[PDB]
Symmetry: D3
């Protein structure tokens, strides 16, 4: 379907709103972010294989590609907005309406039960933390709280097989 392709194209324009609201001047798009979540997911999957941890790599990659696709309809609701609206719920509804196909993949990510869902959750957070560091390098002085995501990572069981990359990142 061309409509689905045009729908994913909205992620090239929809900004990542956390950065924007902080006054980061040319904030990345949701497509920008999702691209690197996929790349990170690929790298972390290979690291998990090295450690003998069984990962369905194909599944993890699909989840990374689709995980923020609901934002093509909902937009990237910032934390401030999430006090008053249920972001994942509206994303899930909108995903169900255009790609029911991938409804179970979003739930995996969203519920973060499966190793594959947790991995993408970790890739998601790593993209964001690393991106905060890069925006500080270009001048942002107000992104310290985007590092509170590391404490969240350790919450996930799979994080115990990724202590070396989590440390590489701490070392920023």
């Amino acid at each position: 379907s061309i409509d689905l392709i045009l729908l994913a194209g909205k992620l090239k324009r929809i900004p990542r709103m956390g950065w924007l609201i902080k006054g980061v001047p040319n904030p990345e798009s949701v497509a920008d972010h999702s691209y690197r979540v996929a790349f990170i997911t690929l790298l972390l999957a290979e690291e998990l294989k090295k450690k003998g941890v069984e990962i369905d790599v194909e599944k993890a990659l699909k989840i990374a590609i689709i995980h923020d696709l609901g934002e093509a309809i909902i937009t990237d609701l910032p934390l401030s907005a999430q006090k008053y609206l249920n972001k994942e719920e509206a994303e899930a509804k909108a995903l169900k309406d255009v790609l029911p196909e991938y409804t179970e993949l979003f739930e995996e990510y969203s519920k973060a039960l499966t190793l594959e869902g947790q991995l993408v959750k970790i890739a998601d957070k790593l993209d964001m933390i690393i991106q905060a560091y890069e925006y500080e390098l270009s001048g942002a002085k107000n992104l310290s709280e985007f590092w509170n995501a590391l404490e969240d990572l350790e919450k996930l069981e799979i994080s115990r097989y990724l202590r070396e990359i989590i440390e590489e990142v701490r070392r920023l």
Copy 2:
């Protein structure tokens, strides 16, 4: 309060999402929009005065200033998102938290029963309609989707005609 001023400053950075998702390259901010909504309200309140219609202009200007201030917290949710989320309810909740003193003014705007509430509603739509035509002059070919249902439009036929004649 500097914090409230900072809050209002977020409107300088929050984009108007309709234009952005359509592909308008440097879409206006919510402050840009709210500015001209206040200007249009002032202008139309004077044309109403001439026609012998009574308008509390102070109230109408206050309403225009605050009408999208909730979007500093909520952002400017596009129509696509409004299928899944209640825009106006979320803005009302947010405003009640930070600016409870402007809770009634936002309710006037949303209900659009008073002349002042309806005026700002009309001003809101005119800014958008006129902005679509302006972005079309600079290349947008996909804004065709961007008033008579409001009682007050009968006092404002001339400006509505001028807009339509664009």
Copy 3:
């Protein structure tokens, strides 16, 4: 008239030039600026009603909305240019030519002859000083001179009633 509305739309596009020349990447428009001047005017008006000071709020909001509308013709000439050009008088004359009712209001702001005019002058400078702080948070190191406006706030009769918000903003 739709021409006046089109004229006001120009403030959405016209940059605030002092930021731009300093290297602030995506500086606010004159409309962004005037929007928050109106907001600040409304806050301070209410603050002055508390203190029992009589302000015509309608008039003060009108002045805030129109105070930079002549820049739609003149543009926002920076300090450097104001050494060679009479900006306030060029604006008054431009405004006279498009809406003579708006010339009187501009003059209240410009010459600070009324309490309402003074209030907008202060709101105008508070927007700017706070905006410099915000642009500092996102990387700007060369904006210290935009705090020199704080001293100018004290020159007006109205500032005797705003010794608080002044201190709030000095603290920054």
Copy 4:
């Protein structure tokens, strides 16, 4: 490695130069582009599957992720530049130096040597064609110039329409 992740981040900032040179004012980044190639690759692989065509979906998705990663080092060289400079050859070397393990995947893509490589080449072209249509909707008037296809006749004609 954080270096690789930093390297891939450069794609969020490196512009798709074809559009930029045509005068498109806020051109997509290489990441933006690669995101939608990955999405299109997925969608099309599932259409191939519906038809009973064998395809390693995992491999195709990996290739889509990495297929423009060399551009994080080389940048996205426009056509005008490719008359003087060998873009694929430069991207292949750059990639080898950072991700030697994906050298053969890149080769499958760049020389369209497998069904998976072909699929990503197709998704890659479809993103650019559809993006040119999108930039025409927002104002561009100068974008007209912008085997496994036997299984993809439906989507190819949806695009033509």
Copy 5:
């Protein structure tokens, strides 16, 4: 002086205001504009020289380089602003205070006192006309008035090529 180079760097940021007000989304800077005015001045000067005209190429190039430099202080005054403010006068005063050594060259430009001064004026207009055509290719529909701008007996090949756009 580093202050002079910082002064010239302001032109990389100061936008060409006519396009901006028209709604052209990422308008060229004054430096972008001056760069191509200098390039066109070089082309035009070499065309005159080949056709047998006595032309000081070095001078015309210096003039092209400095001709909008007063806009580092004054900014790029649009037509609307010029009904109320004297632009060239303001530019001349500002140049006088920072680059007094280029006052006489700016005068050649501003008053078209020399052939080299005139040539830069011609390059200046050509840049603008051709840039309107470029911004129309990318979507602008409201730039017709910027084609109104269209020795020239030695420049008829180029002026006809521009007309043909």
Copy 6:
């Protein structure tokens, strides 16, 4: 020829890639850069005349104007790309094909052996280093390497006549 002029117009839009890849948010164009290189060349030529060093100013300004014009075709290849591609060779070829009459001028620039070639090489590096300082003022923390080009100037004989400006630049 309108084609030549359209070609030079490409420099208005082509970014200086070094900045962009660093995260500088609205980086200068090649034309922005090339403008100030021409400016600095003029300025330095005049400083050299005061020190008794004759320069062919006409030639030096032509060189400054054409020196990055091949980037209209090739783009501004960053250092990362230069490890795999011959930038200078590809620009010379592109120039030869469009402006064969300025081939020797771009040779002088690229070799930087003649007085005029050295002069424009100095101006080019000075524009870059000073631009790096300007971008740091607006928030970049990751541009220190660009100052290493100061070291490359001493290797050009003519810089012994330009010690006062080179010291001002170091003083930033």
